[PDB]
Ligand SMILES: Cc1cc2nc3c(=O)[nH]c(=O)nc-3n(C[C@H](O)[C@H](O)[C@H](O)COP(=O)(O)OP(=O)(O)OC[C@H]3O[C@@H](n4cnc5c(N)ncnc54)[C@H](O)[C@@H]3O)c2cc1C
């Protein structure tokens with residue numbers, strides 16, 4: 121329970137670009153206020169940045185030669201209310217913790233990323249998105265208030281629509297550069313079960329994948345995402361396994377599950393690598409029977425699924441996934457469909473092979489100037505680090521930029537300031553807010569300096 125300050129070598133989830141910071145770790149809020157006051161009174165040096173669970177791949181949660189404040193000990197859930205749907209929680213609370221605590225109230229975390237190991241602070245600061253972006257927006261859309269420790273040492277109560285709305289919306293997606301989010305109130309989504317009813321589809325090509333997302337069917341599902349093929353030559357290029365669904369109601373559950381509709385079942389002992397150590401391939405896998413088999417297994421209607429089944433389907437693959445990788449995620453505006461296809465073609469012909477590829481059509485954006493999601497074609501790819509990759513991804517940056525798209529700060533450790541600023545045309549507007557709230561650069565990070573956000 122005691123406060124500690126420790127020189128620590130930090131990296132994001134990508135394990136790249138390490139830098140040494142003094143890491144403060146304390147469950148005492150007043151100690152965090154005092155540390156920020158100390159940096160502020162210092163009138164120099166390299167400032168401070170908050171750090172959550174370190175799930176961002178890049179360098180936004182580290183500060184070489186400065187202070188890093190580990191927020192994970194501030195993890196109190198203050199209250200949950202089923203009538204108002206509000207949760208009041210410290211910024212260090214993580215989404216898995218929150219999901220579990222809130223389920224007995226018939227409340228659902230309104231935006232969940234592909235991993236549950238992210239803090240509320242990290243969720244706000246990266247304005248995270250999920251499988252339901254097109255129906256629910258991003259994390260920032262659901263924050264009703266937050267308490268922000270600013271450079272002047274004061275704790276400001278921010279609301280999306282109040283007098284401090286400008287600062288609220290600069291903090292959403294602000295990558296911790298407006299101050300330290302101490303605490304927040306989130307509006308949860310009501311639910312009668314912890315289950316999904318899901319429809320699966322399998323497409324044969326990129327053209328089919330795009331048509332499926334463009335035919336109006338997306339409006340029938342609150343949740344929608346896809347795995348796609350980024351390695352095969354066209355026309356197989358861009359074929360996808362698509363998973364779409366909505367939260368189930370109690371009466372849609374089979375009789376055996378209806379007695380505990382809000383139950384989160386425990387992740388089981390055995391994963392697929394444990395049961396099939398020699399892999400899943402047989403003599404049929406890559407020919408026409410394999411094709412039919414995968415088509416059939418991935419095509420279904422009204423299937424009842426728990427959270428892991430529906431939302432974390434890679435979990436069953438255990439140690440096989442991510443077997444020195446560069447995570448690259450971008451969105452291209454909806455209208456730019458040919459441009460989007462062109463970029464997918466570029467990736468396939470590049471000689472860089474990504475096996476893990478998520479595809480999603482984002483919905484409307486929010487008013488946060490630095491928010492990543494815009495309506496359009498969102499893709500994540502995972503490239504093994506090898507010769508030529510750095511220069512190739514710089515070419516990808518140019519294409520993404522030229523086609524009106526952007527990269528996501530939570531995934532980036534290598535784009536340039538020039539590129540990033542052009543991708544985010546409201547960056548100057550955001551920088552102006554940051555300069556008002558932090559004239560002395562009390563808040564600073566490796567990303568802030570790299571991307572000239574400092
Ligand atoms: C396997 C995996 C799957 C993922 N899937 C998704 C996805 O589906 N959608 C998506 O949007 N993202 C996804 N991400 C990225 C992840 O959601 C974000 O990186 C998120 O910000 C990580 O939260 P964290 O608590 O680990 O924050 P960190 O990585 O520690 O910090 C990220 C940023 O938040 C800031 N920050 C943290 N706490 C505070 C605070 N209290 N006050 C102010 N600023 C703070 C930091 O300064 C930093 O700028 C995924 C990441 C992984 C590893």
Ligand SMILES: COc1ccc(CNc2nc3cc(C(F)(F)F)ccc3nc2C(=O)O)cc1F
Nearest residue numbers: 234249250251345434435441442478479480500
């Ligand atoms: C245990 O192994 C894994 C478990 C889950 C995943 C899914 N990961 C993601 N899933 C993502 C899903 C989305 C979206 F919401 F768009 F579907 C957007 C971004 C995503 N980013 C990521 C990521 O790894 O950074 C990947 C894994 F390698």
